[PDB]
Amino acid sequence: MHHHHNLYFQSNAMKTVTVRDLVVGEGAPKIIVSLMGKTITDVKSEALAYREADFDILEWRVDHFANVTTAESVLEAAGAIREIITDKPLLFTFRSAKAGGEQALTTGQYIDLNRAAVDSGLVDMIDLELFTGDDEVKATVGYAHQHNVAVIMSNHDFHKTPAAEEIVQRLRKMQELGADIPKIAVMPQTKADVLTLLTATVEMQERYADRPIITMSMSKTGVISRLAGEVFGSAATFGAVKKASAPGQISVADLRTVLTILHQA
Amino acid sequence: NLYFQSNAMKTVTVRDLVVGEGAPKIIVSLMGKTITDVKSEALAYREADFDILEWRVDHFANVTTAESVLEAAGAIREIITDKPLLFTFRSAKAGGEQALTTGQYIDLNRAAVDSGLVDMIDLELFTGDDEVKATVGYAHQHNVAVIMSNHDFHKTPAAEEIVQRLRKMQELGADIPKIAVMPQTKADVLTLLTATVEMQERYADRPIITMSMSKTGVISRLAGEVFGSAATFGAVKKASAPGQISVADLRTVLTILHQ
Ligand SMILES: *[C@H]1C=C(C(=O)O)C[C@@H](O)[C@@H]1O
Ligand SMILES: *[C@H]1C=C(C(=O)O)C[C@@H](O)[C@@H]1O
Numbered sequence: 470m471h472h473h474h475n476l477y478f479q480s481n482a483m484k485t486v487t488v489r490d491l492v493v494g495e496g497a498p499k500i501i502v503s504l505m506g507k508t509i510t511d512v513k514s515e516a517l518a519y520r521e522a523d524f525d526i527l528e529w530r531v532d533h534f535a536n537v538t539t540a541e542s543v544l545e546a547a548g549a550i551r552e553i554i555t556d557k558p559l560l561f562t563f564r565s566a567k568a569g570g571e572q573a574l575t576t577g578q579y580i581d582l583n584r585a586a587v588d589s590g591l592v593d594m595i596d597l598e599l600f601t602g603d604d605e606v607k608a609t610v611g612y613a614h615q616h617n618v619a620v621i622m623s624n625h626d627f628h629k630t631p632a633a634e635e636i637v638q639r640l641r642k643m644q645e646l647g648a649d650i651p652k653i654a655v656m657p658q659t660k661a662d663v664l665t666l667l668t669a670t671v672e673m674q675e676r677y678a679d680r681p682i683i684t685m686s687m688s689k690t691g692v693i694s695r696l697a698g699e700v701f702g703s704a705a706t707f708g709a710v711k712k713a714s715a716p717g718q719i720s721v722a723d724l725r726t727v728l729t730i731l732h733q734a
Numbered sequence: 735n736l737y738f739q740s741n742a743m744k745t746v747t748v749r750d751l752v753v754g755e756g757a758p759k760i761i762v763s764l765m766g767k768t769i770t771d772v773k774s775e776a777l778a779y780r781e782a783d784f785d786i787l788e789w790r791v792d793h794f795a796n797v798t799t800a801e802s803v804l805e806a807a808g809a810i811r812e813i814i815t816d817k818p819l820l821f822t823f824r825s826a827k828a829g830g831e832q833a834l835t836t837g838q839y840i841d842l843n844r845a846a847v848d849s850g851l852v853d854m855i856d857l858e859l860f861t862g863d864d865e866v867k868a869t870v871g872y873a874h875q876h877n878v879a880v881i882m883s884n885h886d887f888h889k890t891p892a893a894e895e896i897v898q899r900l901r902k903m904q905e906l907g908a909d910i911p912k913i914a915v916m917p918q919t920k921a922d923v924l925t926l927l928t929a930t931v932e933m934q935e936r937y938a939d940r941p942i943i944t945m946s947m948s949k950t951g952v953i954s955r956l957a958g959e960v961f962g963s964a965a966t967f968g969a970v971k972k973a974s975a976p977g978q979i980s981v982a983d984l985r986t987v988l989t990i991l992h993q
């Protein structure tokens with residue numbers, strides 16, 4: 470029902486997504502960092518400071534923003550970020566409280582928030598949570614694609630790590646719903662749980678993926694999952710600039726140092 | 735020579751170094767054909783940032799001449815005076831450069847033990863239970879620690895088989911069980927890590943060393959602190975086995991992961 474009177478590319482065959490000249494799914498894993506300001510002032514200060522860091526993609530964690538339900542405030546903040554970080558893809562992510570975030574919204578507010586984000590032309594990608602429901606997600610994925618906005622579809626488990634087979638199925642379901650980059654984060658209770666997440670990454674990437682995926686086992690115990698993306702198949706990884714946006718992230722500089730070492734011939 | 739061991743703390747202590755605690759320890763291999771090659775390598779290694787020095791005796795040309803081996807070991811100990819020295823004759827079947835009869839091999843190791851010049855010896859599990867068990871006891875009677883090793887250069891066995899081999903090594907009295915396997919797929923690397931974790935949590939009363947070889951398995955050489963391998967091999971100049979990275983890069987990752 471959306472009619473028309475940013476531009477990213479995607480190669481199913483090469484299993485890549487290209488957003489502003491960044492080729493996700495090729496070479497060393499790409500570094501994403503989260504900006505988490507409460508007010509417009511905080512968001513601007515963070516954007517200015519982050520410009521010094523070496524990252525590939527900038528994720529705006531909109532759930533940390535106080536005026537998230539004031540449309541004009543959201544847009545001023547996005548614009549401000551876009552004006553400072555002009556050469557990197559900008560990912561818009563409202564993470565719900567049960568998925569690790571800081572606030573909660575109704576399904577209606579959440580869909581409306583992402584649509585406004587997509588309509589703005591200020592962001593290159595949006596994050597859509599799988600638990601939002603198949604119908605709503607499928608429609609919003611289509612809406613994003615109609616405006617040349619890429620989608621990272623995400624799923625989280627903060628209590629435990631599901632069986633490898635179940636992790637693989639959720640990644641496939643996200644792909645089937647049209648996600649450009651399926652993403653999954655799970656919490657290990659044991660060291661074996663970390664290996665279960667990596668097993669699933671390898672299985673999905675090798676047998677079903679026709680696009681990049683992002684995976685992680687959270688907490689210090691799972692840090693290897695944020696470093697070994699190149700060999701096991703995770704196309705991107707999160708680093709902390711000054712504060713982690715999820716448990717287990719290491720500093721952006723140390724992160725780049727490790728990824729480079731592992732990329733070396 | 736006087737090394738300590740604590741089954742309670744699952745540690746092995748050689749010349750002030752505590753294997754089994756903190757970040758994994760870095761071992762490097764010294765490979766020289768003649769005694770002068772050994773002195774050259776030892777002089778060049780003297781600088782490097784490693785914790786244990788492994789002399790790969792299978793690279794030594796005069797391995798069957800008792801006096802040459804003693805002179806080579808003494809030369810190494812004259813130059814590298816503070817770090818534990820590990821005596822390893824790695825057989826051709828297990829990636830070594832030469833082959834010896836069982837008798838020559840056992841005698842070579844007893845002589846090394848007798849010299850007081852080495853702090854540890856490597857014994858290959860598949861040498862024979864009886865010969866291995868006797869040589870472990872012999873080493874222990876002279877305050878020499880034993881790394882017991884097994885290698886599989888063509889494939890990675892099931893995790894459970896990896897676990898049983900590490901348990902057998904423990905059963906035979908190895909101070910540090912060691913296993914190295916070759917990945918043919920990505921899953922194989924994870925299989926080696928699974929085995930390390932399972933052994934560590936459920937059976938180990940001492941430190942273990944594990945590795946998935948080749949560039950594909952390099953992550954196994956870097957994540958020992960979390961998964962449970964107590965030491966890892968790095969290359970000063972040339973790799974003593976496939977997958978090893980430079981000592982500088984190795985130390986860099988180990989530090990980043992410890993903090
Ligand atoms: C997704 C996952 C995160 C992580 O586990 O590092 C960080 C979070 O901000 C992203 O939305
Ligand atoms: C044991 C294992 C090695 C490795 O895989 O790095 C190197 C070799 O010299 C050791 O004896």
Ligand code: NI
Nearest residue numbers: 471472473616
């Ligand atoms: Ni439109």
